[PDB]
């Protein structure tokens, strides 16, 4: 509360570490469905159904331009990528399986790096 603060958690490496995690996600073999925005002209249903599209390239640009105020807003956008994928894709599809794998991969790096 006013003039009463918890001890300062060192956040000065967060930007660098989120960039490293993002690099690792970008270079994973199962990243291909997620590297670029879904083409809203070419994929019927996507525009209407997926209210907030998100992809690794868009996260990378937001990261590089100071549009994440903190590491939690970064994790929200990464998880959005996978939540969108589950909304639109059957679990038993290549893309559906990619999304499960990438979420698992991300969540371990996240825990190992920050928790």
**What span, in angstroms and rounded, lies between the C-alpha atoms of 73 and 67?**
9
| Nearest one of 61, 56, 62 to 37, comparing CA atoms | 56
CATH code for the domain of 97: 1.20.920.10
Q: Tokens 């997926």 appear where?
A: 50
- The C-alpha angle 2, 75, 16, rounded to 5 degrees, equals 85
Which domain does 106 fall in, by range?
1-115
Q: How was this model experimentally determined?
A: X-ray
**What span, in angstroms and rounded, lies between the C-alpha atoms of 100 and 83?**
10
Documented resolution in Å: 1.8
Q: How many CB atoms lie within 10 A of CB 25?
A: 21
Q: Tokens 């399986």 appear where?
A: 97
Please give the tally of structural domains in the chain: 1
Helix (H, G, I), strand (E, B) or coil at 6: coil
| Nearest one of 96, 103, 111, 101 to 78, comparing CA atoms | 103
Q: How many CB atoms lie within 10 A of CB 55?
A: 19
């Amino acid at each position: 509360s006013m003039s009463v603060k918890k001890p300062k958690r060192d956040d000065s490496k967060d930007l660098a570490l989120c960039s490293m995690i993002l690099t690792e996600m970008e270079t994973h073999e199962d990243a291909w469905p997620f590297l670029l925005p879904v083409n809203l002209k070419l994929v019927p249903g996507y525009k209407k159904v997926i209210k907030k599209p998100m992809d690794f390239s868009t996260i990378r640009e937001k990261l590089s331009s100071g549009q994440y105020p903190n590491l939690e807003t970064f994790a929200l956008d990464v998880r959005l990528v996978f939540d969108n994928c589950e909304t639109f894709n059957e679990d038993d599809s290549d893309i559906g399986r990619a999304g499960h794998n990438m979420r698992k991969y991300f969540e371990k790096k996240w825990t190992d790096t920050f928790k």
